[PDB]
Design an enzyme around this catalytic site. Sequence first.
Site, PDB file in Angstrom:
ATOM      1  N   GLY A 104      47.253  25.795  27.705  1.00 30.78           N
ATOM      2  CA  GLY A 104      46.363  26.756  28.324  1.00 30.78           C
ATOM      3  C   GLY A 104      44.930  26.623  27.854  1.00 30.78           C
ATOM      4  O   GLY A 104      43.999  26.660  28.662  1.00 30.78           O
ATOM      5  N   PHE A 125      36.054  34.595  37.797  1.00 32.82           N
ATOM      6  CA  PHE A 125      37.494  34.637  38.005  1.00 32.82           C
ATOM      7  C   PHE A 125      37.907  36.091  37.992  1.00 32.82           C
ATOM      8  O   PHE A 125      37.119  36.958  37.612  1.00 32.82           O
ATOM      9  CB  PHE A 125      38.230  33.835  36.915  1.00 32.82           C
ATOM     10  N   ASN A 131      46.056  44.048  32.738  1.00 31.09           N
ATOM     11  CA  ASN A 131      46.388  42.919  31.876  1.00 31.09           C
ATOM     12  C   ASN A 131      45.478  42.900  30.645  1.00 31.09           C
ATOM     13  O   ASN A 131      44.607  42.037  30.522  1.00 31.09           O
ATOM     14  CB  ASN A 131      46.236  41.607  32.652  1.00 31.09           C
ATOM     15  N   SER A 134      45.112  39.563  28.585  1.00 34.94           N
ATOM     16  CA  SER A 134      44.265  38.582  29.245  1.00 34.94           C
ATOM     17  C   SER A 134      42.805  39.021  29.179  1.00 34.94           C
ATOM     18  O   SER A 134      41.905  38.200  29.010  1.00 34.94           O
ATOM     19  CB  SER A 134      44.696  38.415  30.698  1.00 34.94           C
ATOM     20  N   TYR A 138      39.872  36.669  27.280  1.00 34.70           N
ATOM     21  CA  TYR A 138      38.621  36.200  27.859  1.00 34.70           C
ATOM     22  C   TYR A 138      37.396  36.799  27.200  1.00 34.70           C
ATOM     23  O   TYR A 138      36.367  36.134  27.084  1.00 34.70           O
ATOM     24  CB  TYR A 138      38.597  36.467  29.364  1.00 34.70           C
ATOM     25  N   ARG A 140      37.156  37.471  24.150  1.00 30.86           N
ATOM     26  CA  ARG A 140      37.012  36.765  22.881  1.00 30.86           C
ATOM     27  C   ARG A 140      36.288  35.440  23.080  1.00 30.86           C
ATOM     28  O   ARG A 140      35.862  34.806  22.116  1.00 30.86           O
ATOM     29  CB  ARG A 140      38.380  36.499  22.238  1.00 30.86           C
ATOM     30  N   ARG A 141      36.140  35.023  24.334  1.00 28.41           N
ATOM     31  CA  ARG A 141      35.461  33.769  24.627  1.00 28.41           C
ATOM     32  C   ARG A 141      34.118  33.990  25.306  1.00 28.41           C
ATOM     33  O   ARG A 141      33.540  33.063  25.878  1.00 28.41           O
ATOM     34  CB  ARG A 141      36.358  32.875  25.479  1.00 28.41           C
TER      35      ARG A 141
END
Lengths: 169, 169
Positions: A104, A125, A131, A134, A138, A140-141
């Site tokens: 992933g 996206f 969720n 999830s 994201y 965290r990025r």
Amino acid sequence: KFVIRPATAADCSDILRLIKELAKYEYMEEQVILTEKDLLEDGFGEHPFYHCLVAEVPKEHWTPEGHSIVGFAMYYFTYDPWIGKLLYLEDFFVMSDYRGFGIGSEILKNLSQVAMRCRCSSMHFLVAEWNEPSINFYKRRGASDLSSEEGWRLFKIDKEYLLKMATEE
Amino acid sequence: KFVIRPATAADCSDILRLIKELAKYEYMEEQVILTEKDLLEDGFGEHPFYHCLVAEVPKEHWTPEGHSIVGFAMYYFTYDPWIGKLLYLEDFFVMSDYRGFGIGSEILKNLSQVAMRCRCSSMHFLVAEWNEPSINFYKRRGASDLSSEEGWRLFKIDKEYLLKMATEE
């Protein structure tokens, strides 16, 4: 372990298989109408309406059914009047017995390189509000929730209604 | 009165002008970084990353600044793993002194025909949750709020963060 590479026409059977497997995974149960013929025509025809990356595993690590592809990501390019070309991640899925191997994260890495290569200002996206795992993954990025920040809601008008507007007074 | 037609390279100056005018209209103040060069390269280069329809008014009804284009719609095609090709409406804008003439409804009509012609199962687009007038306008035409129905939230990862993921361990 595995490799992330662009899909080829020969991979369309694997992709549809994974899409149908993804459709089962999802909770918002919906019927997959796409056929391998569609994926071929729409992805490897004159104009590609989507692009796919696939995760292939060694011949001696195939799927119980004898499959080398155990994951995929589907993306395409979009456009923003303010900043230009964007990368849009449509879907990302890895077979159950292959999750937790980093596949992933490798796909995400590859998508990021595509964005850099094709001069995309950002990658958009969708994430379901329920969720939380999830959402945090994201965030965290560096991801930002534009629906939460700007109030955007996704709307859809079905073909039935499109036809009416296409042929009305 | 006016005509709705596909944009040509010569219309890129008009489109950027309208985009900058749209950016002013918007409340979520953001700087338009796009240049006419970008619109040309991205829309009339080897691969079109967007398509535009424009509203042109007769030579004897031009804009006070001498412009024949008083509106535009930007769209592109997207893809859904379940149903296939979709039409995506990115933006729609008509100059103030030209609204209430039906131009807006004509553009929507033309977009619907594009959807029919290119075999798109539906048309997706974003609407701000606070824009009740627009929400009702679309609901009156059969639109469904997918964010409200399925919980979808739009997320974004900026280039800064994309670069990190593209070049990390």
